[PDB]
């Protein structure tokens, strides 16, 4: 590994570990925040399985070296590139969306807390991203979850919601087409029957 590259690792490490504080310092130096979607891209690239798990020196070095980066400017440019791709490329976006669940899931849990999910959903499902949907539907979904006491979200539901919004952009394409006997998660059937109530 180029000396330059190893020096980046050494610079951000906290007492022998590239830990969550190392990561925060690192991405902030690049211009981002821990909660950004771009951070998910970074983590996915570096092979993180859990946000709070330390990154091994070898994984840091090999990944960057493989991507042809040896300096902090190289690294900044690489993440800019992935960020643009998240906005533009539906396949990568989907990949990052699916990856997000496990990355933010507490290692000791099976489901995530609804608040955390909404936090990321608010970012993922904006119109600047490849999945185009009406803001009302998204907010209705959040309200459904809050009103009906849905306090955790499973991986199957997390994963299927993407498909759901892919096929159903409006509160009204759903009325026109939604079939509650199909294979959608039952939580989405419940959302469907709240949506028809309202109109």
């Amino acid at each position: 590994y180029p000396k330059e590259l190893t020096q980046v690792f050494e610079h951000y490490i906290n007492n022998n570990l590239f830990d969550i504080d190392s990561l925060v310092k690192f991405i902030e130096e690049l211009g981002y925040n821990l909660e950004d979607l771009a951070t998910l891209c970074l983590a996915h690239l570096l092979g993180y399985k859990k946000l709070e798990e330390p990154l091994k020196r070898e994984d840091f070095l090999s990944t960057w070296f493989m991507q042809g980066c040896s300096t902090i400017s190289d690294m900044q440019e690489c993440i800019k590139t992935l960020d643009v791709k998240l906005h533009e490329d539906l396949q990568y976006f989907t990949q990052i969306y699916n990856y997000a669940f496990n990355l933010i899931l507490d290692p000791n849990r099976k489901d995530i807390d609804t608040d955390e999910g909404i936090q990321y959903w608010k970012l993922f499902f904006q119109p600047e991203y490849p999945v185009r949907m009406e803001p009302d539907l998204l907010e209705a979904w959040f309200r459904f979850l809050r009103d009906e006491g849905k306090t955790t979200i499973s991986k199957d539901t997390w994963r299927m919601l993407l498909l759901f919004f892919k096929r159903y952009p409006t509160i009204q394409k759903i009325i026109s087409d939604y079939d509650e006997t199909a294979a959608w998660p039952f939580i989405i059937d419940e959302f469907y029957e709240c949506l028809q109530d309202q109109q």
Binding site: M160, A182, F186, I187
Partner: protein, 86 residues
């Protein structure tokens, strides 16, 4: 304190007994078929449950969701089939 009305406790028992029955029915089918389209599983589960009671699709889907959560079933890549997991 009291979470539940008396009528609510009875409704809860009823549902639990239906769900427990449908969960075992579904596991039986999938253990033998291994892989199945959603439509075919739901239909089969209702037909095999008919002996006992009239299973509604919504009940079957709840049962399916529980078996996924418990790690008995994996949704297929097409998003509308299931695979049995031993």
């Amino acid at each position: 304190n009291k979470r539940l009305t008396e009528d609510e406790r009875i409704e809860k028992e009823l549902n639990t007994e239906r769900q427990i029955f449908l969960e075992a029915c579904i596991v039986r089918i999938m253990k033998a078929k291994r892989n199945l389209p959603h439509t075919t599983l739901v239909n089969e589960c209702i037909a095999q449950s008919h002996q006992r009671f009239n299973a509604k699709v919504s009940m079957v889907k709840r049962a399916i969701d529980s078996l996924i959560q418990k790690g008995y079933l994996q949704r297929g890549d097409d998003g509308e089939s299931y695979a049995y997991l031993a």
